[PDB]
Write an enzyme that holds these catalytic residues in place. Sequence first.
Site, PDB file in Angstrom:
ATOM      1  N   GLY A   1       0.788  -1.218   0.000  1.00  0.00           N
ATOM      2  CA  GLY A   1       0.000   0.000   0.000  1.00  0.00           C
ATOM      3  C   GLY A   1       0.821   1.269   0.000  1.00  0.00           C
ATOM      4  O   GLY A   1       0.242   2.358  -0.071  1.00  0.00           O
TER       5      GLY A   1
ATOM      6  N   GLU B   1     -15.512  20.115  -6.402  1.00  0.00           N
ATOM      7  CA  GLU B   1     -15.702  21.138  -5.383  1.00  0.00           C
ATOM      8  C   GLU B   1     -15.230  20.695  -4.002  1.00  0.00           C
ATOM      9  O   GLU B   1     -14.895  21.562  -3.188  1.00  0.00           O
ATOM     10  CB  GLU B   1     -17.161  21.607  -5.366  1.00  0.00           C
ATOM     11  CG  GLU B   1     -18.197  20.530  -5.210  1.00  0.00           C
ATOM     12  CD  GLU B   1     -19.606  21.069  -5.368  1.00  0.00           C
ATOM     13  OE1 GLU B   1     -19.756  22.300  -5.518  1.00  0.00           O
ATOM     14  OE2 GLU B   1     -20.560  20.265  -5.372  1.00  0.00           O
TER      15      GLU B   1
HETATM   16  N1  GTP Z   1      -7.069   0.799   9.432  1.00  0.00           N
HETATM   17  C1  GTP Z   1      -6.558  -0.425   9.508  1.00  0.00           C
HETATM   18  N2  GTP Z   1      -5.189  -0.604   9.515  1.00  0.00           N
HETATM   19  C2  GTP Z   1      -4.665  -1.851   9.595  1.00  0.00           C
HETATM   20  C3  GTP Z   1      -5.498  -2.958   9.668  1.00  0.00           C
HETATM   21  N3  GTP Z   1      -4.724  -4.062   9.735  1.00  0.00           N
HETATM   22  C4  GTP Z   1      -3.427  -3.683   9.706  1.00  0.00           C
HETATM   23  N4  GTP Z   1      -3.374  -2.317   9.618  1.00  0.00           N
HETATM   24  C5  GTP Z   1      -2.147  -1.507   9.559  1.00  0.00           C
HETATM   25  O1  GTP Z   1      -1.702  -1.457   8.218  1.00  0.00           O
HETATM   26  C6  GTP Z   1      -0.333  -1.795   8.119  1.00  0.00           C
HETATM   27  C7  GTP Z   1      -0.089  -2.604   6.850  1.00  0.00           C
HETATM   28  O2  GTP Z   1      -1.005  -2.167   5.871  1.00  0.00           O
HETATM   29  P1  GTP Z   1      -1.430  -3.059   4.596  1.00  0.00           P
HETATM   30  O3  GTP Z   1      -1.979  -2.178   3.502  1.00  0.00           O
HETATM   31  O4  GTP Z   1      -2.462  -4.073   5.025  1.00  0.00           O
HETATM   32  O5  GTP Z   1      -0.104  -3.854   4.139  1.00  0.00           O
HETATM   33  P2  GTP Z   1       0.340  -3.942   2.588  1.00  0.00           P
HETATM   34  O6  GTP Z   1       0.097  -2.645   1.857  1.00  0.00           O
HETATM   35  O7  GTP Z   1      -0.361  -5.085   1.897  1.00  0.00           O
HETATM   36  O8  GTP Z   1       1.920  -4.236   2.650  1.00  0.00           O
HETATM   37  P3  GTP Z   1       2.454  -5.651   3.198  1.00  0.00           P
HETATM   38  O9  GTP Z   1       1.931  -5.884   4.595  1.00  0.00           O
HETATM   39  O10 GTP Z   1       3.963  -5.653   3.209  1.00  0.00           O
HETATM   40  O11 GTP Z   1       1.951  -6.738   2.279  1.00  0.00           O
HETATM   41  C8  GTP Z   1       0.017  -2.564   9.380  1.00  0.00           C
HETATM   42  O12 GTP Z   1       1.285  -2.184   9.857  1.00  0.00           O
HETATM   43  C9  GTP Z   1      -1.053  -2.173  10.377  1.00  0.00           C
HETATM   44  O13 GTP Z   1      -0.529  -1.260  11.313  1.00  0.00           O
HETATM   45  C10 GTP Z   1      -6.874  -2.785   9.660  1.00  0.00           C
HETATM   46  O14 GTP Z   1      -7.618  -3.762   9.726  1.00  0.00           O
HETATM   47  N5  GTP Z   1      -7.401  -1.514   9.580  1.00  0.00           N
END
Ligand code: GTP
Lengths: 430, 430
Positions: B138, B246
């Site tokens: 992400g 907007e």
């Molecule tokens: N808002 C929210 N944040 C989360 C949740 N689960 C994990 N996170 C946070 O998101 C981080 C990772 O985000 P992701 O987007 O799931 O991970 P990714 O982009 O797939 O990257 P990788 O984990 O290396 O595969 C973690 O370190 C958590 O702190 C959730 O259920 N909700």
Amino acid sequence: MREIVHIQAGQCGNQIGAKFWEVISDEHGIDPTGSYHGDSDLQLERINVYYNEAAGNKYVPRAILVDLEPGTMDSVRSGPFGQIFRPDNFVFGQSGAGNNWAKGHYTEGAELVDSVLDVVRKESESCDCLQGFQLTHSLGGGTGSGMGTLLISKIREEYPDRIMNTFSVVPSPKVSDTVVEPYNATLSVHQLVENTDETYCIDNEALYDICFRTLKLTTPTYGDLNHLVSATMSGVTTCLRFPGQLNADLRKLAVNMVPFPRLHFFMPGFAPLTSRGSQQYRALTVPELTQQMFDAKNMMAACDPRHGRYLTVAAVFRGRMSMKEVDEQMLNVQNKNSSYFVEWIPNNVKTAVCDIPPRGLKMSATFIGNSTAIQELFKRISEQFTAMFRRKAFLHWYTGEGMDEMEFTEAESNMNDLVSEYQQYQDATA
Amino acid sequence: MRECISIHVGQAGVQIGNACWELYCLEHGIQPDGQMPDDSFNTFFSETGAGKHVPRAVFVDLEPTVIDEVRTGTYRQLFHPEQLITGKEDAANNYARGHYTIGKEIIDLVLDRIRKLADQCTGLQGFLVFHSFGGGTGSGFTSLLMERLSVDYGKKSKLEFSIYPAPQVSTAVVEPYNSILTTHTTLEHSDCAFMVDNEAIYDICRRNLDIERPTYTNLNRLISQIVSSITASLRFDGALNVDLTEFQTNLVPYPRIHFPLATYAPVISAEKAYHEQLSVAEITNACFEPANQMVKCDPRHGKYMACCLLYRGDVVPKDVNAAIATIKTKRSIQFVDWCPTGFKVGINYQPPTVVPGGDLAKVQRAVCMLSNTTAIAEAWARLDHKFDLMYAKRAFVHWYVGEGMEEGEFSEAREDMAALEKDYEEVGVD
Ligand SMILES: Nc1nc2c(ncn2[C@@H]2O[C@H](COP(=O)(O)OP(=O)(O)OP(=O)(O)O)[C@@H](O)[C@H]2O)c(=O)[nH]1
Ligand SMILES: Nc1nc2c(ncn2[C@@H]2O[C@H](COP(=O)(O)OP(=O)(O)O)[C@@H](O)[C@H]2O)c(=O)[nH]1
């Protein structure tokens, strides 16, 4: 990223891997024939991480057996759950060096390493989503350490895009089958400090001490240490064998726990103290387990963790506990002993909780960390090598092949630089 | 005709996307098969001649696990498999792997599906995407995707719903590095972005939700509620409406300062629903409460720019004006001379909706106030402290160096975020 390739090396590595397989199969509900028979869906949810689907509904370990002495494979077959392993994974030399690296590295190592490359490819290109390799290897014996170094080097150069992992059985001075331990240890570390990316060193003399005093095992044999180290290594790999957001795969573990290219050496930790056959252990409160990670005898490396500062911290608890109390305890201990960490690494204490406890236990504690306390192993091997090389004792055994000591000088210089890096990271302020 | 496109990346991001799409289909009363029991639903859903409705979005990630459970969840007759893309390698909390090493090998196919689903987007207004700063996928794939679409179209909007990680929920210590890289590489492209500090949602679940310990499901459900409250103006029509263009005009006066700190209220547990709900004045006062936002900032040290509100419930315009007048008397509101105007009003009569069986109880009035001020710079300061304490010792940099990257990009991103924060404080300086 859903599978891991296991590799064994040396005898002690072979029995520790076999014990690992049998304990995890016991906690994964896998019968001796390989068919699932448990009840919890978590065990079968991602059994592919350490198992492969086989004929019928059978599950087979994705391991490989590497050694030179013919007795190692026979002993592996003798032990329980030996038959569930892949029948063609037995790759053993026809002579056996017997803790003699010089003979086993070249005379028997060439065809052996070619065959193991062939088989690792056989289950690599056939593999779906391969990520990395992890090893259970020894270092006291020159032969097993030699195979471990050869395999790790070849699989790293053939697969630079795959995570590298290995577990080391560090030689101890209390028991010494051969005195060629310094040479083998120096060459092995010179290879791995850049070859490997994960290293959970297991110090033998710590195992002997804990068996003698804490576990009352006055005569620590191979199995006595193997049971406890297998329990600890099942605890540490519980991060991978079952679903969990923390440390999803080996690469996440490496990036979270390795702060520097040469900082891939780990303090193993497990609690509560347990032995083989002793059922007298009762339920223990969580705060006891939380404070247990500060105990040297509850570690698997005879160090002084109080001296060092934990660069990174990994912990998992198995059982059904109200884990809000758990992270309250972790916050309390962090506030109490922040002097035992580094202020410039924000929130290195990463911890998750596992629902299923290990066999013969209801709550358990597993500790993994990175600090400068590992540097005392390097200091010990340095002083042992200096004592053994100042008079050039037993050097003629190695020089019988014809190699010089230039690579020995390179290895000792590199490990001294590693020790200096550890010391400078410890002394570093905020 | 007014088509819009959403994107989902990262396990957390795609999970929040699944939750928000669930709450969306409950808002419109869309069954999992897509049966139809405003016309703005066509902006997020595409309807075929057979009456089947599929959201105009896409869930992608380098790992299939979350996509696997999505494809084995409860919406088989809702999403076509071709907008559910899974990779093989994993970024593993690494921006480099998610962007260049692994990101570019799949983004071409990702763009193939994006183009094919945009083939029928005649009235396309902009793109939506969900990502977490900590998430390596992400982070890297998000930045790569954002810059790629900026190259492809440019003026087409690209608004962000970001998740700001928190230490209690954090999994990777390298997360501030990823946050800095994302903000530096997306600042020139993110027209508008919303952060979600997980400490805020953690404390909201702990105290406001009366939950003993926050869970991913509950926090993600409330985040999806906030997202739906934000996007209701796009997904619904009322007397006062605000659209993406907007949104950008009234929320992003400074191109560099494109982080409008929103807020949502109110929240109450099911067991506490027996008490009378807070009135319009009461909820409006509860808006600016320091622990009533998606970040753990300090609004008492902020310089406001202009109020934007989102009433979706039983709020009459008279109550809106009364609440605005009462808030104008608040002693914690400081404005800026270059933006004399400080209020924007948007009212929706549609009652709010919540996931069945969730912790949050049904209410008849709601508020999603939109704000932007120097108070958001506290999170910037926290991540700056983390980044400076780590990068000074060059911790964890070697993982990025091993993927064809140097320290120079880290340094220049550091000074770019320093320039951003000094811009915040300078605008805050009288
Ligand atoms: N808002 C929210 N944040 C989360 C949740 N689960 C994990 N996170 C946070 O998101 C981080 C990772 O985000 P992701 O987007 O799931 O991970 P990714 O982009 O797939 O990257 P990788 O984990 O290396 O595969 C973690 O370190 C958590 O702190 C959730 O259920 N909700
Ligand atoms: N903890 C533990 N250590 C062992 C075991 N077997 C051997 N060792 C250690 O390994 C050293 C000998 O190495 P060895 O296993 O013979 O090397 P190899 O024959 O090449 O595999 C000795 O100093 C022992 O301390 C075991 O089962 N458990």
